[PDB]
Amino acid sequence: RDHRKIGKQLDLYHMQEEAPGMVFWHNDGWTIFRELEVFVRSKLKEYQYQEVKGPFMMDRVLWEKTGHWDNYKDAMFTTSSENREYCIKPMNCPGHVQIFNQGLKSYRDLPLRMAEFGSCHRNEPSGSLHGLMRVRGFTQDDAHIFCTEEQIRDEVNGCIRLVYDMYSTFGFEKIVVKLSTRPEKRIGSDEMWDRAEADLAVALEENNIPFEYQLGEGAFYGPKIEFTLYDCLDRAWQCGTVQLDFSLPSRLSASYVGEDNERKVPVMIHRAILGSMERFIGILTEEFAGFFPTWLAPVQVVIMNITDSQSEYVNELTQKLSNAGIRVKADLRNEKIGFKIREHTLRRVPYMLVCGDKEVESGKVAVRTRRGKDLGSMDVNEVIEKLQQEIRSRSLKQ
Amino acid sequence: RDHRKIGKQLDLYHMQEEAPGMVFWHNDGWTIFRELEVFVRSKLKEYQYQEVKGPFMMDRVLWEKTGHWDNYKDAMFTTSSENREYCIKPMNCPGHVQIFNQGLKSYRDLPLRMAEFGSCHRNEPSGSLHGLMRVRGFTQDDAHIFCTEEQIRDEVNGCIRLVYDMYSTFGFEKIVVKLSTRPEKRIGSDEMWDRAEADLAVALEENNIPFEYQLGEGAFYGPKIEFTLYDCLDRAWQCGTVQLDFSLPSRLSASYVGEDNERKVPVMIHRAILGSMERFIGILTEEFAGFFPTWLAPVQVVIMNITDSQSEYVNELTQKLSNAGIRVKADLRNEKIGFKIREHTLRRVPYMLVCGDKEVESGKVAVRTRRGKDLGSMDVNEVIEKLQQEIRSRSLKQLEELEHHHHHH
Numbered sequence A: 001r002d003h004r005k006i007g008k009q010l011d012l013y014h015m016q017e018e019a020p021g022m023v024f025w026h027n028d029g030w031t032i033f034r035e036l037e038v039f040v041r042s043k044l045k046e047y048q049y050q051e052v053k054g055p056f057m058m059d060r061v062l063w064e065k066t067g068h069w070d071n072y073k074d075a076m077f078t079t080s081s082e083n084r085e086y087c088i089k090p091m092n093c094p095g096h097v098q099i100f101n102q103g104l105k106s107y108r109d110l111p112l113r114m115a116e117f118g119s120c121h122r123n124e125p126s127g128s129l130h131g132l133m134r135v136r137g138f139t140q141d142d143a144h145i146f147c148t149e150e151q152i153r154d155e156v157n158g159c160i161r162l163v164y165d166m167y168s169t170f171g172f173e174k175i176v177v178k179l180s181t182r183p184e185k186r187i188g189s190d191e192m193w194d195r196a197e198a199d200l201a202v203a204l205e206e207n208n209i210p211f212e213y214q215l216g217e218g219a220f221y222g223p224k225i226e227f228t229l230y231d232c233l234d235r236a237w238q239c240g241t242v243q244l245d246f247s248l249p250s251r252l253s254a255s256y257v258g259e260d261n262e263r264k265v266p267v268m269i270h271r272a273i274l275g276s277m278e279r280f281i282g283i284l285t286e287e288f289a290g291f292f293p294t295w296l297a298p299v300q301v302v303i304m305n306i307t308d309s310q311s312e313y314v315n316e317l318t319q320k321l322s323n324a325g326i327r328v329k330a331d332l333r334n335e336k337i338g339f340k341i342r343e344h345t346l347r348r349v350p351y352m353l354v355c356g357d358k359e360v361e362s363g364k365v366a367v368r369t370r371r372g373k374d375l376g377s378m379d380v381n382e383v384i385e386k387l388q389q390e391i392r393s394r395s396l397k398q
Numbered sequence B: 001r002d003h004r005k006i007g008k009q010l011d012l013y014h015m016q017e018e019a020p021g022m023v024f025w026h027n028d029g030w031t032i033f034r035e036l037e038v039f040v041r042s043k044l045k046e047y048q049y050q051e052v053k054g055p056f057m058m059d060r061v062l063w064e065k066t067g068h069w070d071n072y073k074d075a076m077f078t079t080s081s082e083n084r085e086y087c088i089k090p091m092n093c094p095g096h097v098q099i100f101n102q103g104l105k106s107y108r109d110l111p112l113r114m115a116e117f118g119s120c121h122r123n124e125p126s127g128s129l130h131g132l133m134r135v136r137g138f139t140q141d142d143a144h145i146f147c148t149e150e151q152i153r154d155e156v157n158g159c160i161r162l163v164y165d166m167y168s169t170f171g172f173e174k175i176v177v178k179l180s181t182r183p184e185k186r187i188g189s190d191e192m193w194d195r196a197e198a199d200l201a202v203a204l205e206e207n208n209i210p211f212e213y214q215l216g217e218g219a220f221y222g223p224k225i226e227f228t229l230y231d232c233l234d235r236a237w238q239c240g241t242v243q244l245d246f247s248l249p250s251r252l253s254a255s256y257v258g259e260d261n262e263r264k265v266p267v268m269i270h271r272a273i274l275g276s277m278e279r280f281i282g283i284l285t286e287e288f289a290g291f292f293p294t295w296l297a298p299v300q301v302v303i304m305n306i307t308d309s310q311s312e313y314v315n316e317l318t319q320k321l322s323n324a325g326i327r328v329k330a331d332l333r334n335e336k337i338g339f340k341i342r343e344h345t346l347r348r349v350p351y352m353l354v355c356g357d358k359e360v361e362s363g364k365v366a367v368r369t370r371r372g373k374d375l376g377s378m379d380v381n382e383v384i385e386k387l388q389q390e391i392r393s394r395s396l397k398q399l400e401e402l403e404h405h406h407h408h409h
């Protein structure tokens, strides 16, 4: 099952030829995107990240300094104003360094972990575009960690642990790791590349991760660990990535005062855990075949009446569920109850609550699921507490 | 005092010449921006809005169809790929209509209220840029409501109610209101403009809102109610706006099946309540002189020790307040208590919890505020519950406080 077909059926998003590779998130798909942002934020809270927002575009001059112009030119969208040329950012790193560069820094500030849900644009050839997997405008759950050489091992280990921690929520059984080494066009010395590739290879082995080399596929600024997930057709897609950069901070004049009073350039680790939100949503859509776990489901509960005799009770329950923080809708249409149930089932709404006269008298609800399971009559507070528990725990099934 | 000065003082954001009019949001300014998004979302929910995201760019051909190319050329950034020209969006409306246009719509689907925190770029001349108030890249708390002619009154009224509801949280109740009428360069017939302008005036009148006309200041596609807020120099900034558009939906082939199975074109109401997030933060910054309400404050509480002896205790408390959902920092430095209070007052931190030996003993904290007020010792759990309530109610004013700092009484 193809995320593009499911995305249309569940009204998640669309794309059009007036904007190739550019996603229009509809309400329900955007709800998924936002829930993923909430999840990421909760994880970055524990791991102590800042969260920032950089500018959408910056002077071409700045992208010339980083090496992006010489090593990344063809991917970049450019625009002009008042005789100055700007690049729409294809990466968030240079903006993060700009923010790091505001205010004197010392060893006391390191490791400084700086995250952003960063909108990137990369001008992918149109013949290479595919659904949500390969687009031109996407958002990374990005971060750059500024640290000392002595902190590299712990900080890279932290990124690796974050990947497996977050991925375990979604239950991925196939996670293939690649180590992508020096590409033909690059910055930094061969010596720097030797150290950076060895640091990543050793980090993988210390974490007991079998990996394969992907020769020549590293970033222009540094080698990359890539966490690869697989779509329905078993095509490989880079999702999480951890990269070691001994070059950009220097090109952008980043420095701090060390514990020993020597002013030094910080090491920068680049990482994304999900990768791009769009691609990760494509993956989840296929992985679950549109049956999103309850915490991610655009609409968690639909409550239906049999006739308008139960309209008032249905409205009351809907407000009660909604105030409990559940994404709930009332379906009060003059349609047969079996017509309503089938519609919400096909929409993959996890839970459907049916209210007939028996339910109104008892203060209960008849509960069924999108898999056709019939949970019978349940008391309203019990369904609320069960749902709240499954949402709060981000449970994989139930 | 200017929001740009306070912005530096509180490390909210900065700007550089490498990106004129593009904001770099630091952690603490982004915290305020994010909390405003949460607040607006709470209202989108209550008022029954979808929330969507349109793409940054779309073909110039589409922008030509709207009348934006003729009427809005100067302000648009363009870029190209594979011999096709794209406009970076200056508004979110055309993207919303593209979403509406997916799948057959019926009168049953109306009113359809579609919100977006919509990132816009407008190529403002560099000479007229001004801090956060006038930038090139900004985010509107935007929405378009697609409705029938019979629904206009209720839907415009709903937007007006939403403006006063949201502004009341900040203590803005006496709002200056203008009705901006047809500009010299416009689309749509005189008849359509007469109607749209009357509809907005009747809505204001029905709501007992005094207003003035502002001739020729309407959007190219429709007239605008404008809600003005003032900065420290009493300069008038457009914040909230509610607009009536009988032109764009037809230009972009929007339709729905009416009750007699006839094809109809939806009316579109545009509105932003805060305006742009950047401009609204600038306004709040100046209005409160950086004394943001606790729910918005980048750092809500600072816990400080006197000597090394209380460091262990402060850390326990910081962890405890942090698990309770409060934005809290520890200040463990070898500095005098008064030195710390002055710093965190300049940082506008609502509450400062002072921990000496006697506090370690009794499991309590000595509470001070950024307004110089000594609130005595309180129990940790008492402080937590009171902060939680101040945050959840989005209270304008602090514990035991009559009047928050605000420039306009």
Ligand SMILES: Cc1nc(N)c2ccc(-c3cccc(S(=O)(=O)NC(=O)[C@@H](N)[C@@H](C)O)c3)cc2n1
Pocket (backbone or CB within 6 Å): A090, A091, A092, A093, A122, A123, A124, A132, A133, A134, A135, A136, A138, A140, A142, A143, A224, A239, A241, A270, A271, A272, A275, A276, A279
């Ligand atoms: C053209 C195109 N289309 C997509 N759909 C894409 C989807 C995802 C990615 C992608 C996502 C995360 C990371 C990277 S990366 O280039 O390997 N790395 C970076 O960008 C780093 N600067 C970042 C992790 O700090 C790339 C890149 C894409 N590029």
Ligand SMILES: Cc1nc(N)c2ccc(-c3cccc(S(=O)(=O)NC(=O)[C@@H](N)[C@@H](C)O)c3)cc2n1
Pocket (backbone or CB within 6 Å): B091, B092, B093, B122, B123, B124, B132, B133, B134, B135, B136, B138, B140, B142, B143, B144, B219, B224, B239, B241, B270, B271, B272, B275, B276, B279
């Ligand atoms: C150039 C520039 N710089 C800013 N800082 C700006 C800050 C805010 C605004 C602004 C905010 C809200 C609304 C409008 S508007 O042009 O009047 N109206 C619209 O854009 C409508 N399409 C929308 C409300 O649906 C404009 C426009 C700005 N333009």
Ligand SMILES: [Zn+2]
Pocket (backbone or CB within 6 Å): A091, A092, A093, A144, A270, A271
């Ligand atoms: Zn990066």
Ligand SMILES: [Zn+2]
Pocket (backbone or CB within 6 Å): B091, B092, B093, B144, B270, B271
């Ligand atoms: Zn609009």
